[PDB]
Structure 1
């Protein structure tokens, strides 16, 4: 099951403007909760979440850079999962970034 969100690159906090069912089911947060949150998805952060990984994802968004970052995330129920976050900038003809697609894959459980 694919898990992904789409972020608005033209607002300061890169707000989530779409999230698919797979993503919501993965992390245990409903679409209503996820929508309009910064697409870094800090609400998934917990004890094992590496500062360096979080920083690297944030960097990719700032610099509109395509990048895969593997990071420990937490579902609503507290379970930890190692997640490969795939940051994909989508630019127009001019070269401006219009949105980001972020894909999430579970690497392994806990």
Structure 2
């Protein structure tokens, strides 16, 4: 990429494990900035990492569309619906084939959940991932 933004301050680490134990952490999800046009990942879970076989260091400063995961089976119409879901103010699911780093494939359900701020405008997207059919 020709240019990138950082600005991530260090969080708590031990306490964050108590939130992860208390919360519904058992599914895959990532947080992306909705104001930036490409929708860069600003945060990610632990389940998304093991589901695809990448890492936070690789998926950080990337667009949340995950276009890199598209193989020969991947549906260009679904890749479009994920990109168009980032133009909407409301919740949206799209179904699509992704690859895993070991060379296996699967149908993923991608669900974007819009996060509004204190003024009632959408400023972050949470994208969740679920395996709907393993191939």
- TM-score bracket relative to the smaller structure: over 0.9
Give the corresponding residue for 2:129: 104
Q: Cα offset for 1:85?
A: 0.5
Q: Please give the alpha-carbon distance, in whole angstroms, between the structure 2 residues aligned to 1:58 and 1:95.
A: 22
Deviation per residue, 1:26-65 (Å, 9 max, x gap): 0000111011100001111111110111111110102233
Q: Which runs of 5+ in 1 are unaligned?
A: none
Task: Find the aligned partners of 1:64 and 1:32 in 2 and give their Cα distance.
Answer: 29
Bigger Rg, structure 1 or 2 = 2
Query: Secondary structure at 1:47's aligned position in 2?
Result: coil
Which structure exhibits the higher relative contact order, with contacts defined as CA atoms closer than 8 Å and separated by 6 or more residues? 1
For the residues of structure 2 that align with 1:6 and 1:103, how far apart are their CA atoms? Answer: 9
Query: What is the alpha-carbon distance in structure 1 between the residues aligned to residue 51 and residue 95 of structure 2?
Result: 16
- CA-atom RMSD, angstroms? 1.1
Shift of residue 19, structure 1, vs aligned partner? 1.1
Q: Which residue of 2 aligns with 1:43?
A: 68
Unaligned ranges ≥5, structure 2: 1-25
In structure 2, distance between residues paired with 1:66 and 1:49: 22
Shift of 1:10: 1.3
- SS of the residue aligned with 2:103? coil
Runs of 4+ in 1 over 4 A off after TM superposition: none
**Larger strand fraction of residues:** 1
